[PDB]
Design a protein around this ligand. Structure first.
Ligand SMILES: O=c1ccn([C@@H]2O[C@H](COP(=O)(O)OP(=O)(O)O[C@H]3O[C@H](CO)[C@@H](O)[C@H](O)[C@H]3O)[C@@H](O)[C@H]2O)c(=O)[nH]1
Length: 397
């Protein structure tokens, strides 16, 4: 399995992974998250944990269960931490704590290393036994809702360490080690592997999208932080100068997002009037369909208001597509302004750069190549895996 990555990263990184893994062969490692299918965390763990096993680590991945009430609370925490907005009643904290207790009763926590992914299972640390506990934060916690952060910091401050996606998310109100590890893409997954043109054509055709006209694509949940409405507004402004252009918004449900269905309707509303707008909702693990659309796209957008990293940016850059990205969080380490695409602060700036890229085929192609090179150097699964092993070795001494 690992030997296959030599092509992309060279012998020296593969040697490094083997020597780190050799030191860790005797350790039991648990990963805990809140979703089995959908979202970036499940995307990482579905590839990362099997690779840990290939290297001879005793790695397990557990998904917590919860009610709709629990996932309503966790999503409100998610939005509050990233945006600093909203009212959070004390009832939310009681619901949160009860589901930590329920899950703790059904998870064996006495692993050498426990990785807790994102806020949903952070409270499990109350029931810790032996071993090293690491909190893996996938979101923007630079400017959080003080009530939600106050509550969660009570748990995080009990961890042995913390991983954030970029240094800028490191907290000055935590004294535990805060390690920056960017997420990555697995070039060998069905999400990112080469596709034959016949498959790309067939999937784009199936969804009624014109393969002969430009495609502007955003792959994202119907979530306010992804700004599907602002993407529609970007498209409307740009279509004035590229009237043949089409917009594809490709969304899909996650287990732990109970408002994915609500935001659709204000997207559909904002879309009514335009017929080259395609609002797709695909089942979980529609890997090949996302792959195909990313390969069909002329330009890809990830115009997030808030973003921990945004795997969809690296997925597009790897397939040699330039990205127009929201000027926020981990998008800024993937989109090198004027090299791998453009960082934008408004739909107006998004539209400006959409028209520029649609009118400049040679620039698109060169930015595409620079994107793939930037992902190759920085955001492949081998790099993320090596930093995980390094983090474990450090934090277990
Ligand atoms: O219809 C869809 C929409 C998305 N995806 C995939 O789902 C993932 C989405 O990941 P990302 O764009 O990163 O978003 P989140 O689900 O919000 O992921 C969280 O965790 C990720 C990993 O750390 C970070 O990149 C994010 O910023 C963070 O919010 C990618 O693999 C997408 O291809 C699909 O397969 N189908």
């Amino acid at each position: 399995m690992i030997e296959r990555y030599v092509e992309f990263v060279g012998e020296h990184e593969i040697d490094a992974i083997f020597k780190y893994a050799e030191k860790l062969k005797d350790l039991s490692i648990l990963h805990v998250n809140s979703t089995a299918a959908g979202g970036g965390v499940a995307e990482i763990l579905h590839r990362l944990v099997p690779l840990m096993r290939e290297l001879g680590l005793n790695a397990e991945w557990k998904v917590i269960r919860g009610s709709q009430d629990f996932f309503t609370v966790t999503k409100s925490f998610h939005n509050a931490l990233q945006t600093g907005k909203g009212e959070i009643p004390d009832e939310y904290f009681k619901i949160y704590d009860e589901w930590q207790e329920i899950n703790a009763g059904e998870i064996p926590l006495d692993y050498d290393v426990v990785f807790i992914h994102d806020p949903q299972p952070a409270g499990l640390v109350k029931y810790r036994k032996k071993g090293t506990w690491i909190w893996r934060c996938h979101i923007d916690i630079s400017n959080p809702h003080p009530k939600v952060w106050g509550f969660l910091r009570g748990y995080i401050s009990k961890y042995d360490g913390m991983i954030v996606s970029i240094p800028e998310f490191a907290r000055d109100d935590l004294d535990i080690p805060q390690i920056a590890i960017p997420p990555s893409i697995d070039p060998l997954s069905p999400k990112n592997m080469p596709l034959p043109q016949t498959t790309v054509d067939r999937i784009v055709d199936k969804f009624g999208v014109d393969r002969e006209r430009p495609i502007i694509l955003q792959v994202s949940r119907y979530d306010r932080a992804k700004d599907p409405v602002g993407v529609i507004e970007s498209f409307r402004l740009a279509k004035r100068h590229v009237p043949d252009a089409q917009l594809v918004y490709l969304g899909s449900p996650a287990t732990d997002d109970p408002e994915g269905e609500v935001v659709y309707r204000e997207t559909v509303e904002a879309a009514r009037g335009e017929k080259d707008v395609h609002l797709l909702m695909l089942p979980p693990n529609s890997h090949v369909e996302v792959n195909a659309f990313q390969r069909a796209a002329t330009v890809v957008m990830q115009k997030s208001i808030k973003e921990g990293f945004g795997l969809t940016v690296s997925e597009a850059l790897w397939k040699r597509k330039p990205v127009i990205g929201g000027n926020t969080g981990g998008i800024r380490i993937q989109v090198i302004n004027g090299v791998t695409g453009f960082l934008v602060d408004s739909p107006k700036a998004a539209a400006y750069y959409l028209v520029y890229l649609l009118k400049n085929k040679k620039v698109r192609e060169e930015m595409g190549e620079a994107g793939r090179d930037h992902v190759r150097r920085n955001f492949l699964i081998t790099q993320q895996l090596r930093r995980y092993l390094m983090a474990i070795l450090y934090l277990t001494k």
